[PDB]
Design an enzyme around this catalytic site. Structure first.
Site, PDB file in Angstrom:
ATOM      1  N   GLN A  44      -7.918   7.598  -1.795  1.00 61.18           N
ATOM      2  CA  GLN A  44      -8.708   7.373  -0.588  1.00 61.18           C
ATOM      3  C   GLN A  44      -7.833   7.200   0.641  1.00 61.18           C
ATOM      4  OE1 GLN A  44     -11.135   7.552   1.812  1.00 61.18           O
ATOM      5  NE2 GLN A  44     -12.478   6.936   0.128  1.00 61.18           N
ATOM      6  N   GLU A  60     -13.251  10.447  -6.413  1.00 57.28           N
ATOM      7  CA  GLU A  60     -14.570  10.304  -5.815  1.00 57.28           C
ATOM      8  C   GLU A  60     -14.818  11.459  -4.857  1.00 57.28           C
ATOM      9  OE1 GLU A  60     -11.931   8.060  -4.935  1.00 57.28           O
ATOM     10  OE2 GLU A  60     -12.535   6.966  -3.141  1.00 57.28           O
ATOM     11  N   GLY A  64      -6.939   2.908  -7.713  1.00 56.59           N
ATOM     12  CA  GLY A  64      -6.808   3.439  -9.051  1.00 56.59           C
ATOM     13  C   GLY A  64      -6.443   4.905  -9.058  1.00 56.59           C
ATOM     14  N   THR A  65      -7.088   5.684  -8.194  1.00 55.79           N
ATOM     15  CA  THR A  65      -6.755   7.097  -8.102  1.00 55.79           C
ATOM     16  C   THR A  65      -5.373   7.291  -7.506  1.00 55.79           C
ATOM     17  OG1 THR A  65      -8.126   7.023  -6.124  1.00 55.79           O
ATOM     18  CG2 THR A  65      -9.039   8.060  -8.064  1.00 55.79           C
ATOM     19  N   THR A  73      -7.413  -5.818   0.191  1.00 55.50           N
ATOM     20  CA  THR A  73      -8.811  -5.435   0.069  1.00 55.50           C
ATOM     21  C   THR A  73      -9.177  -5.167  -1.382  1.00 55.50           C
ATOM     22  OG1 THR A  73      -8.219  -3.159   0.603  1.00 55.50           O
ATOM     23  CG2 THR A  73      -8.966  -4.571   2.402  1.00 55.50           C
ATOM     24  N   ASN A  86       0.307  -2.788   5.443  1.00 59.94           N
ATOM     25  CA  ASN A  86      -0.757  -2.696   6.428  1.00 59.94           C
ATOM     26  C   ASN A  86      -0.800  -3.862   7.387  1.00 59.94           C
ATOM     27  OD1 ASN A  86      -2.233  -0.243   6.061  1.00 59.94           O
ATOM     28  ND2 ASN A  86      -2.888  -1.034   4.075  1.00 59.94           N
ATOM     29  N   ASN A  92      -3.785   5.542  10.490  1.00 59.54           N
ATOM     30  CA  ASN A  92      -3.450   6.880  10.030  1.00 59.54           C
ATOM     31  C   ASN A  92      -2.768   7.680  11.125  1.00 59.54           C
ATOM     32  OD1 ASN A  92      -4.687   6.191   7.640  1.00 59.54           O
ATOM     33  ND2 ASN A  92      -6.616   7.202   8.159  1.00 59.54           N
ATOM     34  N   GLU A 146      19.296  15.783   3.368  1.00 61.24           N
ATOM     35  CA  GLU A 146      20.192  14.796   3.957  1.00 61.24           C
ATOM     36  C   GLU A 146      19.725  13.368   3.747  1.00 61.24           C
ATOM     37  OE1 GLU A 146      23.052  16.282   4.754  1.00 61.24           O
ATOM     38  OE2 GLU A 146      21.590  17.630   3.825  1.00 61.24           O
TER      39      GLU A 146
HETATM   40  N1  LIG Z   1      -3.054   2.702   5.842  1.00 56.89           N
HETATM   41  C1  LIG Z   1      -4.236   2.978   5.308  1.00 56.89           C
HETATM   42  N2  LIG Z   1      -4.584   2.426   4.101  1.00 56.89           N
HETATM   43  C2  LIG Z   1      -5.781   2.698   3.550  1.00 56.89           C
HETATM   44  C3  LIG Z   1      -6.664   3.532   4.192  1.00 56.89           C
HETATM   45  N3  LIG Z   1      -7.766   3.631   3.431  1.00 56.89           N
HETATM   46  C4  LIG Z   1      -7.599   2.881   2.323  1.00 56.89           C
HETATM   47  N4  LIG Z   1      -6.374   2.293   2.391  1.00 56.89           N
HETATM   48  C5  LIG Z   1      -5.774   1.408   1.393  1.00 56.89           C
HETATM   49  O1  LIG Z   1      -6.151   1.792   0.090  1.00 56.89           O
HETATM   50  C6  LIG Z   1      -6.104   0.653  -0.735  1.00 56.89           C
HETATM   51  C7  LIG Z   1      -7.050   0.762  -1.925  1.00 56.89           C
HETATM   52  O2  LIG Z   1      -7.003   2.026  -2.540  1.00 56.89           O
HETATM   53  P1  LIG Z   1      -8.003   3.158  -2.017  1.00 56.89           P
HETATM   54  O3  LIG Z   1      -7.201   4.296  -1.458  1.00 56.89           O
HETATM   55  O4  LIG Z   1      -8.942   2.566  -1.006  1.00 56.89           O
HETATM   56  O5  LIG Z   1      -8.848   3.657  -3.276  1.00 56.89           O
HETATM   57  P2  LIG Z   1      -8.094   4.566  -4.344  1.00 56.89           P
HETATM   58  O6  LIG Z   1      -6.607   4.445  -4.163  1.00 56.89           O
HETATM   59  O7  LIG Z   1      -8.544   5.989  -4.169  1.00 56.89           O
HETATM   60  O8  LIG Z   1      -8.582   4.008  -5.768  1.00 56.89           O
HETATM   61  P3  LIG Z   1     -10.131   4.136  -6.156  1.00 56.89           P
HETATM   62  O9  LIG Z   1     -10.980   3.347  -5.192  1.00 56.89           O
HETATM   63  O10 LIG Z   1     -10.334   3.613  -7.551  1.00 56.89           O
HETATM   64  O11 LIG Z   1     -10.520   5.589  -6.096  1.00 56.89           O
HETATM   65  C8  LIG Z   1      -6.499  -0.500   0.164  1.00 56.89           C
HETATM   66  O12 LIG Z   1      -5.647  -1.593  -0.055  1.00 56.89           O
HETATM   67  C9  LIG Z   1      -6.297   0.003   1.571  1.00 56.89           C
HETATM   68  O13 LIG Z   1      -5.331  -0.784   2.212  1.00 56.89           O
HETATM   69  C10 LIG Z   1      -6.321   4.090   5.403  1.00 56.89           C
HETATM   70  O14 LIG Z   1      -7.106   4.832   5.978  1.00 56.89           O
HETATM   71  N5  LIG Z   1      -5.103   3.813   5.965  1.00 56.89           N
HETATM   72 MG   LIG Z   2     -10.292   5.093  -4.160  1.00 58.33          MG
END
Ligand SMILES: Nc1nc2c(ncn2[C@@H]2O[C@H](COP(=O)(O)OP(=O)(O)OP(=O)(O)O)[C@@H](O)[C@H]2O)c(=O)[nH]1
Ligand SMILES: [Mg+2]
Ligand SMILES: Nc1nc2c(ncn2[C@@H]2O[C@H](COP(=O)(O)OP(=O)(O)OP(=O)(O)O)[C@@H](O)[C@H]2O)c(=O)[nH]1
Ligand SMILES: Nc1nc2c(ncn2[C@@H]2O[C@H](COP(=O)(O)OP(=O)(O)O)[C@@H](O)[C@H]2O)c(=O)[nH]1
Ligand SMILES: Nc1nc2c(ncn2[C@@H]2O[C@H](COP(=O)(O)OP(=O)(O)O)[C@@H](O)[C@H]2O)c(=O)[nH]1
Ligand SMILES: [Mg+2]
EC number: 3.6.5.-
Lengths: 54, 132, 436, 436, 426, 427
Positions: free
Chosen positions: F10, F61, F134-135, F169, F196, F218, F244
């Protein structure tokens, strides 16, 4: 079963003698029909009623 | 703006199929420009991507068209379904596959899905009679 | 260089009506029969002469005969779009079906109609000048496509003998099928398609379903989307006759470069790229790219795995923006892979062929306007399994003599069933003996 | 071209025929006045299969009505679509069979069948190429069973090579409707096993079941039963009257269903049946069709396929559909419930697709399954027959009219052997050693 | 793609579900006759989760309405939004349960559950990728608890890997509807600890408290209580239905909230809920949402969370907001209350954001706090059960039906050791 | 000179979601795919009049992937390049690593193979993921293993997103983080951390956005990756390639954890009152208030540092500034390395997105260093892993998915060995 084309057996009836114990909730997480016989090659009976015997 | 095939026959095509005709059902091709938006031979701006996993209101309407063309046709179907009678037929000449037999639009190939019939309508309790 | 095509049966006509839809688009011939006043899209005033024959003034009629016994499908062509195009005396039609009965179409119902066809095919091959051969289309499932489709071939063998007779069959799929007797019709026909055809091309419907669903992303397909990308294969293996190429290949070359022994002539088609309009212009396809994609088991027009067997001799038709430098650049790599292997005594391998005319798209169809395409036609011992699978379910029925009382009632006898089976059992040893 | 000569026998036959001529005449677009009012070019093209266009622009069915009492003649003249019949094909005796097979097959038969056959001969020589005779009758009464049987035998000995459909209702198991039901049914089936080409079995009991559970009708009249049977007959013969992507006529269905010359008693279902409530909410898709089609509670017969292995099956779909979906649903239903299908026949299911659905519907299907669970009916009927015959109840009404006791004994024994043959071909294995 | 199959049991379940489908249908813009009339095409893209396309824009809910007496479903169908439910999904009983758990679980389930399993199995394999089931029922009634419980047992037996949410209203002695409330609640919780995946506890005390302290209504009919439960249910599954910055699906939420397999009784709360006289004097900021979320007057259970420790918690936000304020607010309310949060779990709060608020609101939020104060509600149920069971009150209408007393003793043992381990982890 | 960029999870998609907006804007590519050689590193020129990117968004997802499919850049990507499963992994490492990974990873890597085969001068891969989910962590790990066994000798730059010390989170992300690092040690080549909390403080302090969302995070992350890949894209006086980084920043094959930084993060109005020269932005790139990872390098010792420069910079004063830094006593360098800088200059000034919050500045610096303050981060995560694992919390989820206690204990001891290594080398 309209849902899945497989024929299925109907669910067993719940009995009061067999209830739900303490841990069977975890037994769950760990947890085929046929046409009956239509026997053609079995021996048909014959009682001793033949006219010859009589 | 539905297509007008130059073919003419004794009967008229039913409104539920004549109101929605695509550029493909013509009598005469445009030998000059086959790749064009007229024949859906170019990528459709409308129509979801082949990977799209959302819900498109067609689902099963189209039978032999690709995802983008299917979505385009079903959306146009639901779009001009307003002018049609209320319980209009559900299929359409565009959703159904385009057979080489029938692109010429000679005969009336799709009429049964909308004809007024009494075929499989069993009697309601109010309309029930014992044939006295 | 004129070749005439006969279409035999429900499948022969349906397929043919998409094949002829295509050619009329390749040579700018409107369905009314003639090319237009303006808009001379095509170059070459001769190109059409191998399929069409210009009669009198401004009218190109095909060199073809739709033949059938049921008048239900032919009369769809009599009044379809191409009412004008197909002249009346080529749409042969009978009165009562063979009805999925090889014997019925080969002995009873075939005999009164075969004379009418073989008298027509003559005065077509007479208008011709340099007859290259015939190319027949049929399905070996039904009766018409199997019964007289075999009877017609045999009599073509007597009257001509040496003229090539291309065979494009549509074999029954392993499991996804629509008939019950089709094991019987398939064996009885092949035994006679064996000694009369010059090149036979296998085609299973299911292995073409998987293509449209996966590649063309068509969730629900139908016979049209199958018959569409069959003409794209017929179009490609004949474009060397019609348009100029850097390295052309004629009909008499196929027979010479693909048939090692007089009975082993069954080809594994393929094609690439089969791609929709949406991915066509995003993914560049290089001459070396598509030739890779034309060798996977996931892109064969037949459901047999070329890994179970050894390729004997492959054939490669390219079309479009192709230069002979890259053709030889890619074929190098393919021989170097270890997942595909040729037989010991064929060190040479391929036979390429390049044509400049890009494939055409059929409006309302499914493909896209492509830069360049390939139509691979191989010959492998991978089919050696197809007949064995088709044998197993034939003998599975014949041991009870199911469905047989129909065939002998029409004029056959129990001899043909045997003598056709030990033919197929002998053919299997042939694919074994070669693969040693 | 292909032609179906229709024959209706007795009271049940005539009522079913009235309903069947109404649905077909409306399918082809003619009003009850006999005049044509259609919208369809595809309607005219194949009406000759059922209609002789009389001068003055009025189509009349090719049907012959027979019975032994003028009451049913008046009834069939009365109702709507009743004056569409030619008043010369209304052949009828004047005494009445009296629910007596002897009276229907020996006394009143031999007196009426001559004029009946004169009419039938004229009607058959009218048209050019006969496909078949269709015979709608019952098996309980005298004039439907006995006279219809005499007629079948005469027609077979006259036209020995034409198709013969027999739509027959049989005595219900749980509730009879005539005390001499078994005495009639036994002789009738003894003759049908020799003369008819295929017999589609119906039952008023299963019809009530369907109309009360699926249709959820409060009070189903006989109108609705004849309605369902008429829909089924229209479905089974549509493929002749309309062009489809895959075609299947009467002879083709026979060849594909009947493996052995004695096994021609089918069972029937039709889809989709749904109450007007759920009709608003359900969607018509090939899954929704096949799910109801394969249901045992949907067959229009007293045979329940849970007691026997499907020998073969056939499915005629109507409406424009995905052949891939059709064939994959057939494959899935064949592969999941694999134990309920016979072993020594691979791919037990024939499919066919006609492009025109019954009016108002988007898509529909008809099922004709040759199952070995049809022996239940004959076993029950034969045990009831012997229960009566051992004490000779009601026997004099036949014996004192020409029939002997050898006739009854021969008929019971032939039925008792047919059931044993069913048992054999149900319990047979492929490996052939395991059953001993 | 991910599918939620809805199941309603009993009287409360049917009326809660009636308001639920009214709210969801409004969120997806489908009118009461069954046709889509939304404005943005955000709504179409995710109605497979809750509806099935019938014929020409006709979407019908994926719901199964069951009970032993059609008395409630007659009023359900007679009301507005009645033509949407498919007539085949209703299931019938002619006898009636009558607050009798045995009648709902042994005698009438024995012939009812086969038909409803056929309906659930059909509706579950019509779709492709199940997300899980979602059940609404009571714990005091007979056909809600008994029938609903046997259904949970059968479904968890057949489809064991899919999720399962249970919204169950529990009894309180002050809002005491039935007299056998402990006999039904005790046996029902005994089944739910062993079959359900997670249970969100509701009760009418806290719902009245909300409608009189926060909403300050005059006459809070049951339609409004059923609406509050409805707004909660929609807020739970919001992230499945709309695109979000940080998505949280049902399984995602369960794994972030349930530390031990037995500790899955949550207390829920919804925000913002202010009277129409005080919507003038307030603002709508994330601080205003969080201050109202963590207040104990806004829970929907009769258990004060500050009588124990929050094990974990979850907050689903809706609307365009700033994740910085979201995170710093969750961090602040966690540092300032150092005594109400368990020590051996850092960052006890899982948060997630979605971008489509409910219609007519700028910003919303929903709370699911797996606390350890829920054992107070289990004590006030367990002690009543001992008070009656010591002297066999009302026991024969159960014993004379087939049930044994060991089911009661065992129900008490699982209730008692479960509150023992809640008290251990506090 | 081509680098393909995969995005897992995500956060990976949303980061790359701003990255590819920046790339299309820097090369002027219209969103429908055509211009109105420098771009060759990112967009392959297909057919004619069409540029498709060398990236893969992959996720389990389908919500954010098909949001891309509906958004503005329908026509930019492939239709087939946006991989997406049907069901998520749900913050579950084992679920994403052994249940669903086993079906999605084969289609993924058999897509990247023909992307790499389309390429000819592949510099390397670069992966975007957050280890909190997780992903991102689960099949992220699984993909990196199969990339390492497929290609191996090519670079795999990893821009990961660790959990912040107090901002979080999720709850189980320590379990996911520890299980993720056991493969992030020996499978990625150059791993750049991105917390973050640090980016929240930057957006609050420098850009003065009182309400920042993930889009602003982002966007500035995209500025960092664009600034260190501009060495390949745009031509400068003295530029480096991908090879490098691992040559001048990785003294030992197991010590690769790079603090990132950037300067100047400046708003539109604060810019008017501040001079932006080479001196102060090189100084301000070393203050802990302008790093992207929350750790205090005052406690650590720098091992090696790299400085990417963009804009109007000629080497005279960049050599002067790195000289002054070397003489400063606030920050210390390790004995093991006397000359610990690697400068790089690029001509093109950093662009700006219309509607973004960053000012259009003529010169910028992307500093990427190495220290032992990372040795502080791993312990600050190790403590709050040991709190939860001492009570066996949440374990039954991973065990149910198919793992055991062995992977927990051995991944914890792997972090212990990594800590021992950092305290050894820092001496
Ligand atoms: N810097 C940044 N971090 C993000 C952003 N969106 C989600 N995160 C981080 O992603 C972490 C959780 O993992 P996610 O990417 O939301 O979900 P996932 O890694 O796909 O795992 P699943 O929910 O099981 O599919 C959170 O701690 C957020 O800090 C973003 O747009 N920018
Ligand atoms: Mg996710
Ligand atoms: N590729 C393709 N195959 C078809 C098509 N239609 C029918 N078939 C095949 O044809 C076989 C049956 O034979 P048909 O062609 O339908 O009919 P026939 O061969 O003329 O035999 P009869 O109908 O008895 O005269 C089926 O097994 C199908 O595989 C089609 O449109 N396309
Ligand atoms: N389907 C149907 N069956 C009927 C009808 N009328 C009678 N039958 C059946 O016919 C059987 C009695 O045979 P009968 O009508 O006397 O035959 P007939 O005397 O030769 O005409 C009973 O089993 C009835 O079920 C009808 O209107 N519809
Ligand atoms: N919120 C809410 N609670 C209800 C409603 N109807 C009943 N209840 C509660 O449910 C309990 C009684 O449920 P009951 O009707 O006996 O369940 P059933 O008989 O098994 O269907 C009481 O505690 C009521 O307070 C309702 O419409 N809304
Ligand atoms: Mg045929």
């Amino acid at each position: 079963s309209k849902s899945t084309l497989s024929y299925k057996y109907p669910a067993g009836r719940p009995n009061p003698t067999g209830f739900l114990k303490k841990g069977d909730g975890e037994m769950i997480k760990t947890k085929k029909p046929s046409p009956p016989q239509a026997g053609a090659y079995k021996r048909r009976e014959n009682p001793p009623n033949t006219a010859f015997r009589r | 703006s539905p297509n007008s095939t130059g073919t003419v026959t004794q009967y008229n095509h039913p409104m539920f199929v004549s109101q929605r005709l695509t550029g493909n059902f013509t009598s005469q091709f445009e030998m000059n420009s086959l790749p064009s938006h007229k024949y859906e031979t170019l990528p459709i701006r409308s129509g979801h991507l082949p990977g799209y996993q959302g819900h498109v209101p067609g689902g099963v309407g189209a039978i032999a068209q690709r995802k983008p063309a299917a979505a385009m046709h079903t959306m146009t179907h639901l779009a001009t379904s307003g002018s049609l009678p209320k319980g209009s037929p559900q299929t359409d000449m565009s959703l159904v596959d385009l057979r080489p037999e029938q692109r010429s639009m000679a005969k009336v190939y799709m009429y049964a899905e909308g004809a007024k019939t009494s075929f499989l309508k069993f009697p309601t309790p109010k309309t029930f009679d014992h044939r006295n | 260089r004129e070749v005439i095509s006969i279409h035999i049966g429900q499948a022969g006509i349906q397929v043919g009506n998409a094949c002829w839809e295509l050619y009329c688009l390749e040579h700018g011939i409107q369905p009314d029969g003639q090319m237009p006043s303006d808009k001379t899209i095509g170059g070459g005033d001769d190109a059409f002469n191998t399929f069409f024959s210009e009669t009198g003034a401004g009218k190109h009629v095909p060199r073809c005969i739709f033949l059938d016994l049921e008048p239900t499908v032919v009369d769809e062509v009599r009044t379809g779009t191409y009412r004008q195009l197909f002249h009346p005396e080529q749409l042969i039609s009978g009165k009562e079906d063979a009805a999925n009965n090889f014997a019925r179409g080969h002995y009873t119902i075939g005999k009164e109609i075969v004379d009418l066809a073989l008298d027509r095919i003559r005065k077509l091959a007479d208008n011709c000048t340099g007859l290259q051969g015939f190319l027949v289309f049929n399905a070996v499932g039904g009766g018409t496509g199997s019964g007289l489709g075999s009877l017609l071939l045999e009599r073509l063998s007597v009257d001509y003998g040496k003229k090539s007779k291309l065979g494009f069959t549509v074999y029954p799929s392993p499991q996804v099928s629509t008939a019950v007797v089709e094991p019987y019709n398939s064996v009885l026909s092949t035994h006679s398609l064996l000694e009369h055809t010059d090149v036979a091309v296998m085609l299973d419907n299911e292995a073409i379903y998987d293509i449209c669903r996966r590649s063309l992303d068509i969730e629900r397909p139908t016979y049209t989307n199958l018959n569409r990308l069959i003409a794209q294969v017929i179009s490609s293996l004949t474009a060397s006759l019609r348009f100029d190429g850097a390295l052309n290949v004629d009909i008499t070359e196929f027979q010479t470069n693909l048939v090692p022994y007089p009975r082993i002539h069954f080809m594994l088609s393929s094609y690439a790229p089969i791609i929709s309009a949406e991915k066509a212009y995003h993914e560049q396809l290089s001459v070396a790219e598509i030739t890779n994609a034309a060798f996977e088991p996931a892109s064969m027009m037949v459901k047999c795995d070329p890994r179970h067997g050894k390729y004997m001799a492959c054939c490669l038709m390219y079309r479009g923006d192709v230069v002979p430098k890259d053709v030889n650049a890619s074929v190098a790599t393919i021989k170097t892979k270890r997942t595909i292997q040729f037989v010991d005594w064929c060190p040479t391998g391929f036979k390429c062929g390049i044509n400049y005319q890009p494939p055409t798209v059929v409006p309302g169809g499914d493909l896209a306007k492509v830069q360049r395409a390939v139509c691979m036609i191989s010959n492998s011992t991978a089919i050696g399994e197809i007949f064995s699978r088709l044998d197993h379910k034939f003998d599975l029925m014949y041991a009870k003599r199911a469905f047989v009382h129909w065939y002998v009632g029409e004029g056959m006898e129990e001899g043909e069933f045997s003598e056709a089976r030990e033919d197929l059992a002998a053919l299997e040893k042939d694919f074994e003996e070669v693969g040693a | 071209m292909r032609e179906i000569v229709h024959i209706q026998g007795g009271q049940c036959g005539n009522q079913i025929g009235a309903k069947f001529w109404e649905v077909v005449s409306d399918e082809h677009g003619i009003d009850p006045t006999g005049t044509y009012h259609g919208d369809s070019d595809l309607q005219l093209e194949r009406i000759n299969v059922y209609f002789n266009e009389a001068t003055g622009g009025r189509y009349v069915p090719r049907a012959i009505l027979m019975d032994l009492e003028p009451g049913t003649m008046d009834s069939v003249r009365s109702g709507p679509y009743g004056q569409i019949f030619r008043p010369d094909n209304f052949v009828f005796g004047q005494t009445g069979a009296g629910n007596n097979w002897a009276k229907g097959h020996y006394t009143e038969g031999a007196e009426l069948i001559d004029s009946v056959l004169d009419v039938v001969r004229k009607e058959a020589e009218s048209c050019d190429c006969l496909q078949g005779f269709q015979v709608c009758h019952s098996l309980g009464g005298g004039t439907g069973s006995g006279m219809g049987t005499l007629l079948i035998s005469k027609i077979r000995e006259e036209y020995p090579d034409r198709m013969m459909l027999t739509f027959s209702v049989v005595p219900s198991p749980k509730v009879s409707d005539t005390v001499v039901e078994p005495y009639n049914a036994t002789l009738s089936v003894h003759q049908l096993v020799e003369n008819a080409d295929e017999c589609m079995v119906l039952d008023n009991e299963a019809l009530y079941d369907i109309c009360f559970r699926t249709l959820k009708l409060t009070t189903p009249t006989f109108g609705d039963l004849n309605h369902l049977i008429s829909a089924v007959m229209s479905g089974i013969t549509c493929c002749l009257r309309f062009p489809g992507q895959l075609n299947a006529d009467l002879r083709k269905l026979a060849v594909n269903l009947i493996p052995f010359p004695r096994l021609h008693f089918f069972m029937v279902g039709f889809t989709p049946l749904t109450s007007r409530g759920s009709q608003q909410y359900r969607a018509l898709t090939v899954p929704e069709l096949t799910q109801q089609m394969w249901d045992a509670k949907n067959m229009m017969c007293a045979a329940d396929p849970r007691h026997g292995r499907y020998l073969t099956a056939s499915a005629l779909f109507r409406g424009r559909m995905s052949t891939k979906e059709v064939d994959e649903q057939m494959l899935n239903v064949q592969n999941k419930n694999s134990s309920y299908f016979v072993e020594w026949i691979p791919n037990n299911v024939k499919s066919s697709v006609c492009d025109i659905p019954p009016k108002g519907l988007k898509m529909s299907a008809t099922f004709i399954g040759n199952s070995t669970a049809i022996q239940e009916m004959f076993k029950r009927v034969s045990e009831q027959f012997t229960a009566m015959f051992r004490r000779k109840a009601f026997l004099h009404w036949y014996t004192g009219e020409g029939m002997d006791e050898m006739e009854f004994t021969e008929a019971e024994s032939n039925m008792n052997d047919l059931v044993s043959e069913y048992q054999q071909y149900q319990d047979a294995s492929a490996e052939e050693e395991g059953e001993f």
